[PDB]
Amino acid sequence: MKLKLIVNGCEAPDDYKLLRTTINTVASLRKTAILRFNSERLTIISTPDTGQLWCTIPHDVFRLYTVISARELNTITMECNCDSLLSVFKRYDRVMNQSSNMTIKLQSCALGITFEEIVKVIMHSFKVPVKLLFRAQDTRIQEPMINYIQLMMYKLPPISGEFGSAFHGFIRRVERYSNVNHIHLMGVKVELKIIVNELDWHLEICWNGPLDSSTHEVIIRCKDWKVCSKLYAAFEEVVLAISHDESCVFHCSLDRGPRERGQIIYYIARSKGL
Amino acid sequence: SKENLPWVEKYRPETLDEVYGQNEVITTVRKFVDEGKLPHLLFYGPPGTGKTSTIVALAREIYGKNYSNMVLELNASDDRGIDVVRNQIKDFASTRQIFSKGFKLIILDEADAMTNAAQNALRRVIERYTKNTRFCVLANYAHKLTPALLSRCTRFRFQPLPQEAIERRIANVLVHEKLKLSPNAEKALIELSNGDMRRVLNVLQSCKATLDNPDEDEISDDVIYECCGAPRPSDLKAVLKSILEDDWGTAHYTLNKVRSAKGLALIDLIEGIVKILEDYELQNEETRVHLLTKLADIEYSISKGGNDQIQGSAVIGAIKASFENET
Amino acid sequence: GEQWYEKFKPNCLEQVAIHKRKLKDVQEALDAMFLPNAKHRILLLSGPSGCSKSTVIKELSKILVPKYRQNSHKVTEFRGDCIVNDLPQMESFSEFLKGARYLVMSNLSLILIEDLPNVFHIDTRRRFQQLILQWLYSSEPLLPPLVICITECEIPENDNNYRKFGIDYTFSAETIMNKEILMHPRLKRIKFNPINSTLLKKHLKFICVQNMKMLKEKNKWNKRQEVIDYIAQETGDIRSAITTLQFWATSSGSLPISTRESTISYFHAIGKVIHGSHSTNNDNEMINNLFENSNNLLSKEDFKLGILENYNTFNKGEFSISDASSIVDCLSECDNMNGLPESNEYGLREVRKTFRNISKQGHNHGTVYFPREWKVRKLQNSFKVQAEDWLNVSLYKYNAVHSFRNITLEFGYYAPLIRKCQSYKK
Amino acid sequence: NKFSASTVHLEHITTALSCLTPFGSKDDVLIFIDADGLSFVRENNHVIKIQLLLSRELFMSYSYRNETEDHMKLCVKINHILDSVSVMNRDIVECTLSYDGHGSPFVLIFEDSFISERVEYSTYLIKDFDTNGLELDRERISFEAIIKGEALHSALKDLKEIGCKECYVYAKTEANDENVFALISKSQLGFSKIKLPSNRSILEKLQVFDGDSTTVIDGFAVIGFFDFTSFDKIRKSTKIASKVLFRMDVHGVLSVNILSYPGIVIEVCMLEKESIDEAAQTEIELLMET
Amino acid sequence: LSLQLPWVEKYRPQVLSDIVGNKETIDRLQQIAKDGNMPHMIISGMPGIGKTTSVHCLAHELLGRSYADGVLELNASDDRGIDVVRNQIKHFAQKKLHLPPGKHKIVILDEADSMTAGAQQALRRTMELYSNSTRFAFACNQSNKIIEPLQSRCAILRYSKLSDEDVLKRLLQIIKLEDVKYTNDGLEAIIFTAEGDMRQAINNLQSTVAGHGLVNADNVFKIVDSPHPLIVKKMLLASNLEDSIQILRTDLWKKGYSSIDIVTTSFRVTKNLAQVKESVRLEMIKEIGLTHMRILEGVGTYLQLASMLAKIHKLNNKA
Amino acid sequence: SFKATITESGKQNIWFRAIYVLSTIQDDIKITVTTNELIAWSMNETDTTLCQVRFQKSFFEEYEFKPHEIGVQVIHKLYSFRVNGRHLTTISRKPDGDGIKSFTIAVNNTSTCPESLANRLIVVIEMDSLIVKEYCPQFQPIKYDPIIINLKYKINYICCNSTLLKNFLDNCNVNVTDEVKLEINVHRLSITAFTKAVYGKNNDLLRNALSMSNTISTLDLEHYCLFKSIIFKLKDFKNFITIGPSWKTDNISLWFCHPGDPILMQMQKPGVKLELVEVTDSNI
DNA sequence: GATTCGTATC
DNA sequence: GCTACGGCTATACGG
Ligand SMILES: Nc1ncnc2c1ncn2[C@@H]1O[C@H](COP(=O)(O)OP(=O)(O)OP(O)(O)=S)[C@@H](O)[C@H]1O
Ligand SMILES: Nc1ncnc2c1ncn2[C@@H]1O[C@H](COP(=O)(O)OP(=O)(O)OP(O)(O)=S)[C@@H](O)[C@H]1O
Ligand SMILES: Nc1ncnc2c1ncn2[C@@H]1O[C@H](COP(=O)(O)OP(=O)(O)OP(O)(O)=S)[C@@H](O)[C@H]1O
């Protein structure tokens, strides 16, 4: 298993930003994020009611993305400590803020993460212990399937757009509250109504700006809503989908193109029903 | 808006002169407050005896217009753990008076339902701040209190309300509601309350409701029995006579008739028979033991549910067997 | 002008109030643990309070640590009161153990842990268990010797809601250390016993002869013998005995001599319930004292199981079957009272009364044992796992559901004699 | 609606309501509504009371269409209201505070063109006791001092940092134009004092009376022993203040007026600890002699 | 408008001379005060027999002028945890306070029976290092609550119930210092209702004088009530069932005592009974347990208590 | 007895940082007052990590010392006492929004002081707004023992710039890595904050193996006197390193000979002397 | 507290 | 531009 990936920031400020966003998200969600290294691309798995995160990182992101294994289509799965990965990525982006690529290898398992910094050859070795999963467990971990019987993909306003800041504020409106645990999202033929119902504290946060894309209702936990809001900040293209009393899909996409597009999907399971 | 209140809440005494029955306690606390010094009180007794209506009236009469800032009331409806006792009570009983009016009363209603750790942490608060704070303890069960807490607390026992006090309160309620009550109905209320004002007030409210015209009609004994589904003395005596004298078939038939024509519960009949059997000769000492043990077992079985017919047959057989030790 | 348990303190190994066999085995274990080979890494000393479980380690280190130390003397007791600024209380012991491992050559010093961290808190308790577990399994080629003197004591009644159990009942080594540590091949648990009367009398007489002027001045030197005998016979605690002797000697009057009361052990309490107490011939007084002094032991369901499993020791089990029937019937009745204190009183009073009317002189008694319930529950858990596996493989092959009751009763037995008996043929 | 007030500036009211944060974090508050404005009264353990006033001139669409009552009172929580008024901004969010009489929610409608958030809170019955119990008596004021907000805030922060289990208040004036006002702290470090400057910039005025509020005496020290768990309840209130006024009477009641439309006025009242130890006052006096 | 201290607090002993009862222990405390070499003590006894007052008086007579900064009175009302023992107690014990010769600081850990196990474990450590400058003075109603490792280095002075003579002496002193009209039968009734509790006797006397004036048996018994552990013993030891039934129905039921209290007091009396056979005692305990179960389940009634009495009389008198 | 004033911002900051670190080494800081310098030192509970800070007379604007007080120890005459670190670290901190105009520490155990001042240290803080704060932290007189290691250690010598070391240390965390593996070679110098792994019963993983590392150079070394694979703790090392840059007046020197002899540390200031001693491992 | 084995000593 | 500060956050403790 000669897994040797190389990440650089200066040559491409978008793919590395996507990788950093994915690492931060998986670290924030839970520990022990799964890393399914294939030959065509990379998938940073985050699987525990609790939501699941799935992303598609194209091999063009890494300059020397090489994954060689005897398994099917050169598939390597390795659960890793996302906290240490978060720390090393923080160190690397601190290095970039202060031209050496973030070369990573699989030493033996252990990730031979290393990158140089100039204040001066400061080689910051960051060996991280990593386990190796088997095919049976890898086949056991699979991306959930969402049936599009009535799934309405509400097109969220772009960040660069004028309505982007207003929509970000609308999303974060419910965040500032403290007694918010479950959020009853509703979507109608389109506008978004963030409604939170309690014993006495009522809430009817609504969005009046134009939106692109019967009624759809779902109740989701506020813990995942902050993650969705954080995701909405980075990616320009953002799709939010609501399943009627079934689930919620926050589909983000980064069109790199020609070149494979990268997407990240977070499936939210209704903490309680309607 | 006081008319839109239950009779147990809008007839709550506001002054010590309206708390009937507990004359000794009222006189003693009046002497204490008139002489200034008030010892740490502890009110004990059955529920509904006026253990709260007395302390609140005393607080109102001591701290006129200042019942709010001078009295801190804590009950089982709110948390009374270690943190609560060590913070709220200490802060309230450790500060100076608002207007130098006197001492700071602290009413702890339902203090029996309190953890022993809290009851032990409260003792030093009671003793170390007794110069400007006097504690009052309300409890229905004395075994739940630490013996040291009982030691550092003057004990006043609120005995069950006598007949005279309940009669006076019933008369006041009748005058206030413009009602008419038969003396037999009043005696039935006395026996039903068994020393409880709230029971009398609730039964009177239900009787007034049960009347077609609450103004021109008098609350009779039959109404007082129908509104609560309680057995009349006549049916209880008939059941006892049938069980003691007639054979097993006619006694069972009489029991079924009594419990069906009026819907009377079996446990109520058991209690009535127990009461009617207390003032009995029963020369043999084994008859008393058999009656008490078997009736207690049947009551315990009824408290857990079962077949009412079998339980009634058990009652009849138990009474007959107990009264065979007579001859 | 100070307490007599100090000043008149042991100065050499001979003065230490400990039995010869205990001293020899402790010294052998320490000498084995100071060798370059590390067969045993930690020495888990245990015993009752004030049983010379601390005063012997320093004396041993006085003549052991310097001998095996390098050239280019005492212990390194863990202070549980040091509140470091930028250090959580759980991390205090972690830092202690992570900095005490550097004492190997030219810095050798025994690590003594007598005052354990707040093991009553679950989080730091399991952190301590992990830390000592890492010590045993450490890949370090050389580690200094380590001693944990867990003073066993009966934790009194507390207002803690549940907080599991074990450490809320006793402060024994089993309630702090886990089974993996206790059964570890590199752990040596040398338990200690209460000080015998002979050594207590010897040391009390030594204290008296070292200070006799005031004893004869207060007309107590002639009465010294009875006081020494009573003190040495009432308690097995050396420090408590010395304190009581000092209190009596310094006093001037007729104050009765009193000492701390020892807590009756589980087997000791079972024997008292079954056989009785030679000190008191009144059953009521003995039962009341047992319940008042130790109610945290008689309230556990183990003690009722202990009586059920050990009442067959009277006269080797040759007592009448009627007595056994009465005992077991009353035990079942007490079990049917949902743990009321009255049931606990009755289940022991009946046993003691039954074993009193049949007490026959010159009848040898057998030995007792802990109730065989942990073995049964482990076997039941194993059977649960077996049934779960059988039902899992059953549903995966064919769509047929079978209740666990039927699995225990019918399916479980016939499943081998069906499947494996047809595997033979295949 | 009986009451309806619209405001454009939300940071001011947000800070005013956050001034009550050091009190009960998640409990009930009482809101009196009259023609002058709306107020927020919070009382903890019947030992300390804080009153915050928001004048009519602060708002822009104050109506108060109620006619049957001179003042309208409602009891609601604090955390939810603080979170709602913490909406911040991107376009001004015009709040639409409303209350449709008895049995109606205290509605907070927030409009931001793109956002039409509406928040409603059910009203609790009453605190059910005489709130006006902590008011000081304006006839026996022992001393009256004015201190700038920053100095008092720094002193309270310093006391909070060093623990300050209990606190003392020392006030004394001399005929030689030398006025001393300081706070003693009984903390884990012992008895620590914080001497405020005698300069008029810090201490504008200090007058120690003799229990009559008219005669100014010299050489007499007024000792106020206040529990710091209630004294730190106005630590952040003085942070946003310009001038802070101190008033304590012989009844052991402290009155602190906090002032930053004629601004915001925060009128708080505190009870004094009974001071069980007699030597405590003596040792404080001896310490103050240095 | 009261400003009047209770008689319990008014005539509180300030010297080790007016503390009545336990003559030998009080003499030992006086000797300690005279010499100064105070050892660690754990005072144990029933409530209200001078345990706290004796500790405070000996602290006053040992520290003297240094009582302000020489004693640290901690209690259940104050926070007593591992943190408080590790900081406040540690700093107080570690404090270097100059004292007269043969004088040590007294950490008054009153109500030590309610302290947490970890706090007592930290007390072990702090007492092992600080006992040449500080001497802890525990005060609890049960010595078993304090862990044995703590009792190892602490001398034990168990207090006994105050006799009817020392209580009478102190009551007469209070009467003389207060000029209260008394009756011999009144004082006897006060002592009887005190049950060896001096504070309870003082409270009863104060209530009697403040509510009725002259202190005789009638005025004492019209405000104070006879101890119910005695009526319970009277009804349990009654040979005839009717007598016990009447003693119950008229003196515990109509008097206003809950059935659960009657059952608990009966169990305690049976535990501390005398002149009864062991088999009879255990059978009565079993019957009390069955009745207690019935009361707890929710069947609390006079009938259950009557059945319990009937069972007890049946097992006493046989068939 | 003595008086010492700190009237400056950087001096007050470095004093506060040194006091905080000494508190993070042991619960009670031990301070010995001398006629030439003020020595505050701390020692670990295992007698493995020792740090001493020596504030010279030039550090204090008015450093007087009259040992004519009635404990006192003679070797020169110096007075020593022990004060709680957690109480001293909350005094020397710089308040936010205001500034310390004058920070003076003094004590007078003479007969003039009353019982309130008996065995009570005096520290006076004056704000820029003329606010004067008085504190009386208690102390207990003790005796001072000078550990003779610096006089004997002056063996290879290493002098390195503390900027990169401090950056690596603040990047490290005291809950994931608890070791420092300082390896210096003729070609390169490497510092790795590794963590040994512990295997369970059935070859499980009880302890992780985080192995943060950093290698820079040999030329950058100010003085690399080899005349090395030493391993020691990390938590105290980071605090001792961060002591220095708190004063905006930064390098550090390394002393170690054998894996048994404790490693010595010393970085100096114009008026502050810093020293750290840590016991290393002898697992050759 | 009861049993069995084991030294140690007068 | 850096600061000093408001908000965020990882977290040891709490009950
Ligand atoms: N002496 C009395 N005279 C008239 N009404 C009474 C009297 N005692 C009680 N009541 C009524 O009974 C109601 C309930 O009594 P409370 O004093 O509030 O409760 P309590 O008697 O203390 O019983 P518990 O133990 O608290 S449930 C009062 O509100 C009155 O209406
Ligand atoms: N002859 C003696 N033998 C033993 N201990 C003695 C003797 N003379 C005095 N002592 C003192 O008695 C105490 C007994 O200490 P140990 O029992 O060894 O400690 P310990 O066993 O840990 O007690 P715990 O478990 O903490 S209660 C010490 O303080 C000794 O100094
Ligand atoms: N022997 C005594 N002589 C005189 N007064 C006494 C005596 N014993 C108790 N008292 C009185 O009892 C009251 C307080 O006694 P305490 O010592 O506080 O009770 P206690 O013995 O400590 O029991 P607990 O556990 O604290 S409730 C005061 O009013 C004392 O005057």
Ligand SMILES: [Mg+2]
């Ligand atoms: Mg009530």
Ligand SMILES: [Mg+2]
């Ligand atoms: Mg020891």
Ligand SMILES: [Mg+2]
């Ligand atoms: Mg007491």
